[PDB]
Ligand binder design. Structure first.
Ligand code: HEM
Ligand code: HEM
Ligand SMILES: N[C@@H](CCCNO)C(=O)O
Ligand SMILES: N[C@@H](CCCNO)C(=O)O
Lengths: 215, 216
């Protein structure tokens, strides 16, 4: 990932935090020169077996995901192939009218974590079922409303052969936290103040991140 | 892009709508087998010609973007290389507690447009300036607050040598509007109603889209 030094996450924990809150990654692998790369939006969790919860240095962590086995990307996934998992969080257009300085150019403040690693296809039906059950239970606790999957386990069994589950062993993780760090602190405060005052929670979320970087 | 039939864009204009609302794309090209694909988040606008010759499904449309020339992806951009531009819109986790049906499985409702096309690297200084000027002007008009760039054009000319601008000639565009179309109407309504009462704009936005998809 290409990241200007002043936009890197100040601490590794920022990356795990963004992934945890936005775990529907874009999973990308190389394709042919004619077709271009493959890309699928799919849910990622850390391996409950080993990594368990989200660490602050992601190197060597084991992640898990799943896709549709009919997805052509599944057939191109091979054990040993490299994969990119791109996670995105809050973002907002920055109008130079907020700056109070001239001259200027507009920009877009945004957040992204690019995780790269090596794929291992999961072939066991039960191991595959464990992955999706771990994804379900994890997300429901974090984002849901106390839903009990007990009465659905037979349903999970029935549809699970269509699940293409896989493991990713992380080789690198990079965060892009473009949050106006290139601007003077007074300028950053005006942008942050403008964002925190809008009824859009995405703008609010961007302002919160902006106020977290050191002065 | 792999899209189950019931999640395809309800109408081609939905792809234009999502791109225009969320124009910071992830621009992706193949890389080495050791490195994996290149990916850069960058702003995309339609070529000004395209609005006056609009193709139904975006096929043949021309799009414009730019990145840092110091970005290693710029050296891999070659005229004629295929590229993927991924745009994402509103999304929200769907808990089966909203369904009121058993059995069920959780899912994530989300929106995405994947645009594939052929790159043309722009090298001319004036054409590069035209790209960033039109991006700034478009985005400011759509998202900004009446900022006038006239006092900053000299500034644009100073820094435009670092811009790597490019054109993409679209070869296909596909939408993924995963908005509970697989559920019965009574189920979709419960999710919409719960999402619209969240007060988070991302959830309310997802609910509004959900309600605008006709029954499949
Ligand atoms: C916890 C949240 C879950 C989310 C967010 C989720 C999300 C997704 C997504 C985005 C896809 C599309 C992949 C592609 O485009 O190739 C997919 C496919 C699939 N997932 Fe999950 N999944 C979850 C849990 C589960 C569970 C518990 C099962 C139980 C077996 C399951 C079974 C499947 C199956 C069978 C497919 C392929 C066919 C279909 O989409 O119905 N998923 N899932
Ligand atoms: C709303 C308008 C704009 C947005 C959202 C935007 C966004 C971006 C982004 C995301 C990058 C980094 C690309 C990468 O990672 O490789 C970039 C690079 C760059 N852009 Fe823009 N841009 C805008 C307008 C402009 C304008 C009007 C100029 C004037 C020449 C300009 C000049 C540059 C330059 C010189 C770079 C590379 C070095 C640097 O970041 O200073 N941009 N832009
Ligand atoms: N870094 C330059 C260009 C930003 C607009 N395009 O990124 C500025 O902040 O003025
Ligand atoms: N189509 C199945 C699987 C959804 C979980 N994976 O997305 C359902 O909606 O129950």
């Amino acid at each position: 990932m290409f990241v200007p030094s002043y936009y890197r996450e100040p601490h590794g924990s920022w990356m795990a935090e963004l992934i945890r809150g936005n775990p529907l990654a874009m999973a990308v692998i190389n394709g042919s020169t004619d077709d271009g790369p493959f890309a699928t939006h799919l849910p990622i969790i850390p391996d409950p077996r080993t990594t368990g919860e989200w660490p602050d240095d992601l190197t060597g962590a084991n992640l898990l995901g799943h896709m549709n086995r009919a997805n052509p990307q599944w057939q191109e996934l091979e054990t040993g192939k490299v994969i990119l998992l791109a996670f995105t969080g809050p973002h907002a257009y920055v109008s130079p009218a907020l700056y109070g300085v001239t001259p200027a150019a507009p920009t877009w403040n945004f957040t992204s974590v690019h995780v790269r690693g090596v794929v291992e296809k999961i072939e066991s039906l039960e191991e595959t079922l464990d992955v999706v059950r771990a994804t379900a239970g994890s997300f429901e606790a974090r984002f849901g409303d106390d839903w009990d999957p007990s009465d659905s386990i037979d349903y999970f069994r029935k549809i699970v052969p269509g699940v293409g589950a896989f493991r990713v062993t992380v080789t690198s993780a990079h965060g892009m936290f473009k949050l106006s760090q290139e601007q003077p602190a007074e300028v950053r405060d005006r942008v942050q103040k403008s964002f925190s005052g809008r009824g859009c929670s995405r703008h609010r979320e961007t302002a919160e991140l902006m106020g977290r970087v050191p002065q």
